[PDB]
Amino acid sequence: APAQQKTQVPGYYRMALGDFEVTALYDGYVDLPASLLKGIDDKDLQSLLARMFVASEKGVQTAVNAYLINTGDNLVLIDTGAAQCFGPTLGVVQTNLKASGYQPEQVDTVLLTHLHPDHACGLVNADGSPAYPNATVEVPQAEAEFWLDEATMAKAPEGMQGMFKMARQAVAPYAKMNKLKPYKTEGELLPGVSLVASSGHTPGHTSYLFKSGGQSLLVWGDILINHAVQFAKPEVVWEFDVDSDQARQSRQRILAEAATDKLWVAGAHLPFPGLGHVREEAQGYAWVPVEFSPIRSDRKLAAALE
Amino acid sequence: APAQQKTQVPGYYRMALGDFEVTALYDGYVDLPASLLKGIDDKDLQSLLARMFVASEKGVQTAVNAYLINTGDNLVLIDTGAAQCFGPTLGVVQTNLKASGYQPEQVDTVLLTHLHPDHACGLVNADGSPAYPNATVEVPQAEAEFWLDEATMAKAPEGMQGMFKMARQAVAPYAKMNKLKPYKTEGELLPGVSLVASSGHTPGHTSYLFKSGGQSLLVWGDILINHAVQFAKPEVVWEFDVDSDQARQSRQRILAEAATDKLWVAGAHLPFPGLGHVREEAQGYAWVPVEFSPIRSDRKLAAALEH
Numbered sequence: 339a340p341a342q343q344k345t346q347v348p349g350y351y352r353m354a355l356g357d358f359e360v361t362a363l364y365d366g367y368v369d370l371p372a373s374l375l376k377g378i379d380d381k382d383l384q385s386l387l388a389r390m391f392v393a394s395e396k397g398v399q400t401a402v403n404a405y406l407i408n409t410g411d412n413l414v415l416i417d418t419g420a421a422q423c424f425g426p427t428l429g430v431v432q433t434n435l436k437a438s439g440y441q442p443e444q445v446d447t448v449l450l451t452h453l454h455p456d457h458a459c460g461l462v463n464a465d466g467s468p469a470y471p472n473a474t475v476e477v478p479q480a481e482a483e484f485w486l487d488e489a490t491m492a493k494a495p496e497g498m499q500g501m502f503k504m505a506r507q508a509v510a511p512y513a514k515m516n517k518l519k520p521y522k523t524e525g526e527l528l529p530g531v532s533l534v535a536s537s538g539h540t541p542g543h544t545s546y547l548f549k550s551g552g553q554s555l556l557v558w559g560d561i562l563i564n565h566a567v568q569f570a571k572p573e574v575v576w577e578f579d580v581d582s583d584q585a586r587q588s589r590q591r592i593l594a595e596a597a598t599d600k601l602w603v604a605g606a607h608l609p610f611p612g613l614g615h616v617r618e619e620a621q622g623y624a625w626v627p628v629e630f631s632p633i634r635s636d637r638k639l640a641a642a643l644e
Numbered sequence: 645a646p647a648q649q650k651t652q653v654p655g656y657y658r659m660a661l662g663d664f665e666v667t668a669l670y671d672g673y674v675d676l677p678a679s680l681l682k683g684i685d686d687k688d689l690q691s692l693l694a695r696m697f698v699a700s701e702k703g704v705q706t707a708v709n710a711y712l713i714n715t716g717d718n719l720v721l722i723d724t725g726a727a728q729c730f731g732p733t734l735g736v737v738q739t740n741l742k743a744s745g746y747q748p749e750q751v752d753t754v755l756l757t758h759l760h761p762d763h764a765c766g767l768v769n770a771d772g773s774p775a776y777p778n779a780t781v782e783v784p785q786a787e788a789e790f791w792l793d794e795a796t797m798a799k800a801p802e803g804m805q806g807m808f809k810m811a812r813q814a815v816a817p818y819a820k821m822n823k824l825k826p827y828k829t830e831g832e833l834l835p836g837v838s839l840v841a842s843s844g845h846t847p848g849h850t851s852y853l854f855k856s857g858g859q860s861l862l863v864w865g866d867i868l869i870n871h872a873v874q875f876a877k878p879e880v881v882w883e884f885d886v887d888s889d890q891a892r893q894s895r896q897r898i899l900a901e902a903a904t905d906k907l908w909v910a911g912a913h914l915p916f917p918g919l920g921h922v923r924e925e926a927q928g929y930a931w932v933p934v935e936f937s938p939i940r941s942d943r944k945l946a947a948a949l950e951h
């Protein structure tokens with residue numbers, strides 16, 4: 339037989355949301371120890387992982403996703419992956435953006451759910467230049483007043499200090515060209531996009547709601563880190579939630595609303611493309627991923643059946 | 645904003661199975677009516693579809709998948725898609741095989757789960773030439789004795805005879821160059837592949853079990869058509885099962901075995917890439933799709949070195 343090709347399909351996936359075009363972008367993966375980075379029983383944890391056929395031991399392989407949304411008026415990127423801040427298994431968001439047929443120069447707006455390295459570090463090329471040189475970076479103010487504050491980094495423990503530095507470094511090239519905007523709760527950023535506060539995981543963690551043609555998409559950030567356990571058991575928390583209790587409360591609220599409104603979700607650490615719906619179950623919730631499809635423009639003729 | 649790109653990512657997806665390289669190939673989709681093709685209450689049906697966020701009305705959009713497995717000894721393609729036999733929403737298997745980095749000339753074996761047009765028509769190019777010119781086509785004997793038999797075709801319902809013609813046309817160019825091989829329930833065809841009989845959907849319907857490095861993949865064909873209802877209720881039948889009773893039994897058996905032995909499944913009408921596992925639920929079963937991942941060579945090397 340001939341040589342095995344090996345290479346994986348590129349990490350982009352296209353979906354229509356009304357008139358908006360969504361392109362999910364894969365940053366890569368990180369192996370995360372199931373151990374702690376948790377809040378429940380070891381027997382229950384392994385049982386929940388096994389039923390989703392998720393290997394732990396060597397860690398739970400976890401996706402990192404970003405979302406590119408073309409509304410017609412704006413080309414907006416929601417989160418940016420990790421570049422090389424978390425090692426060589428990540429940082430492929432910009433290459434998947436290009437593979438998907440876009441150019442980073444076309445991005446006019448970057449929305450950050452929060453300033454963790456796996457969301458912000460992709461803002462910057464390896465050589466220090468801004469990855470999206472024409473974009474304005476919108477960061478939640480609470481998120482900015484936390485990670486970008488000098489004393490706060492100093493009164494912080496060593497194992498957390500690097501994340502402060504990476505945040506400062508991710509955002510710096512945009513601050514220097516006056517392209518950094520910390521925003522407050524008021525004023526809806528772009529036509530068709532509104533804010534959904536979801537603090538806890540970080541102090542200003544924010545989810546973004548896109549609406550077009552009667553359809554809704556919540557690009558929710560890090561509401562949840564492990565789909566196999568935290569949908570069934572939302573009470574389970576993550577070691578690196580800055581405030582795990584508040585993060586838990588945001589998740590419980592967002593989970594309930596998403597389930598009852600039946601809106602689309604785009605989740606940064608849900609299996610790529612990270613697009614789908616939340617369904618309420620007997621005890622907790624379940625994740626229902628999109629089924630792979632070309633864009634159904636022909637079906638878009640619900641428009642003539644009005 | 646610039647113009648929207650609109651185009652979808654190519655329909656191929658790579659997975660490792662032991663030393664084997666699996667490439668799932670998308671053929672496209674077909675909208676199938678939820679009704680008619682079923683065996684339970686309308687209301688219960690819509691409820692099962694709705695809990696998986698599947699729209700019926702305008703019909704259930706259904707994927708058609710084929711599977712390319714590089715065993716090291718062989719490049720074997722399991723099923724081939726529909727070509728243009730079912731219209732322009734299908735027939736993309738070969739272009740996806742090319743996007744995945746292979747060329748159709750490299751395929752030495754084509755395994756067919758059954759001779760339905762969405763599985764066998766991809767065998768022939770638009771010009772009439774064989775799509776896989778160097779390949780031997782392996783078809784289960786019971787499948788050939790049914791679909792390729794003239795008398796059987798003659799006495800068959802008007803609505804079915806098109807499938808008979810399509811089957812014959814699909815297999816014709818390979819039969820001409822003596823590259824058409826009907827095989828019996830016995831004999832193993834290639835190293836690493838075993839037979840799992842699963843008749844019912846058609847009389848010779850056959851599922852293929854690939855085994856490497858302690859891991860197993862069942863390229864199962866059409867034992868199941870709608871993931872949202874037939875995992876949870878496998879007794880629900882499909883209108884085009886030639887023998888629906890027998891199809892139920894094969895489905896029940898195959899699901900039970902897949903769940904207990906934790907086989908990977910490659911499923912022709914499951915949402916692309918159609919790769920994943922079957923889990924036992926309180927009522928019936930559930931489909932657990934593979935998570936998108938590059939091949940973990942590091943993990944595979946580590947496992948081999950440790951023991």
Ligand SMILES: [Zn+2]
Pocket residue numbers: 452454539560
């Ligand atoms: Zn985070």
Ligand SMILES: [Zn+2]
Pocket residue numbers: 454456457560606607
């Ligand atoms: Zn994150």
Ligand SMILES: [Zn+2]
Pocket residue numbers: 758760845866
């Ligand atoms: Zn069939």
Ligand SMILES: [Zn+2]
Pocket residue numbers: 760762763866912913
């Ligand atoms: Zn079929």
